[PDB]
Amino acid sequence: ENAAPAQAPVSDRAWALFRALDGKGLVPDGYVEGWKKTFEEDFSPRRGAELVARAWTDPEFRQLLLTDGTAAVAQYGYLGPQGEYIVAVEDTPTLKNVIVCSLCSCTAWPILGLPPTWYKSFEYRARVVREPRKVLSEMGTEIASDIEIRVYDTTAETRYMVLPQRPAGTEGWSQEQLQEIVTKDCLIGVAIPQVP
């Protein structure tokens, strides 16, 4: 009762699917290898960090990023699969934004990178929509009592990034220096950028 179905090892099943399609000429030469390289090397939260650092140091770009995220991201050439319509959401002294896909794993892949295991977890998908303060607290981020938390559930084609507040102690830093402290977790919204 309630037992798992019998299954071949997952690696055997995944490669069986590949071989079945490949053996029928349906997968172009180097196709999955090309995607693997894109997923590993191109789609990256370093891109989102670059966008944040630019917005932090360039008021005109900040306004573009917050009004037409797609156009802002296009300037850097970072539009892509699962990142064609972008909206950046602005943290403020009274507002903390957090992103989830409660229904599966929807993420702005090209600028955040593929979602991490934890973001796709049933724990995150179930809980962050209902108790984001406790979830963030458990994850190591204390959100002050006077700050509204707003959770964006990625339920359609909008793909989100958080523009976090710029921390004190970073005044005059270069874009490279600022990029370094904007992590994947800052872009998802579960972390606040940290100054050493």
């Binding site: 069986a16 319509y85 593929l114 959770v151």
Partner: protein, 211 residues
């Protein structure tokens, strides 16, 4: 589809398995893990055999206990394989022969889907809307926590996309609709039983009505 995948608001789960900025390791933790997404794109972009919406729906169609015990990337191996069989591109026999053992698939659909709604409204930023009190057995991009609830429009998309309830079943009548960022107060969704502020759901026009 009111399946177990509609997890938002479910109670009883433990801690999220992460502390902020912890090392998450490589993109792929096993040598096969890039295959489900890559073969999804082969199916969508190269073969034109199915839509991304159909991939979401076929994963929703996993038997519920099967869904709950299956790691993320493996669900997409199962989902893409299922679509390839349903579309007549592959057989389950050849998948199991190549796999060297059982390769159970998602369950057949119990709905033919539905067309893009005929009667909808163009909403404006600041307008109050209610999520249509409707039950859809096939694919839908409305999490149950917002069904029948009232919120305010914060954004209307400048692009339009096929209605998921249609294209998620490979129907010819998905049309196109914009979506709306609808902001709900936490208390509208979970009463006193929430510690949040607001939740913004990105909802197709066809899921909404004036409040």
């Amino acid at each position: 589809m009111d399946g177990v995948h509609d997890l938002a608001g479910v109670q009883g789960f433990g801690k999220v398995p992460h502390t902020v900025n912890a090392d998450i390791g490589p993109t792929f933790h096993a040598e096969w893990e890039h295959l489900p997404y890559s073969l999804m794109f082969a199916g969508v972009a190269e073969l034109g055999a199915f839509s991304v919406d159909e991939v979401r729906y076929v994963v929703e169609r996993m038997e519920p206990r099967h869904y709950m015990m299956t790691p993320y990337y493996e669900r997409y191996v199962i989902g893409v394989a299922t679509l390839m069989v349903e579309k007549g591109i592959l057989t389950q026999d050849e998948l199991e022969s190549l796999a060297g053992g059982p390769f159970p698939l998602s369950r057949p659909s119990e709905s033919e889907g539905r067309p893009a709604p005929v009667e909808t409204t163009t909403f404006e930023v600041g307008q109050r809307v209610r999520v249509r009190d409707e039950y859809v057995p096939g694919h839908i991009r409305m999490p149950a926590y917002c069904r029948g609830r009232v919120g305010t429009i914060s954004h209307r998309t400048t692009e339009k996309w096929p209605f998921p309830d249609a294209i998620g079943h490979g129907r010819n009548d998905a049309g196109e609709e914009p979506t709306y960022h609808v902001k709900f107060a936490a208390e509208e969704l979970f009463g006193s039983d929430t510690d949040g502020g607001s939740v913004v759901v990105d909802l197709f026009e066809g899921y909404l009505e004036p409040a």
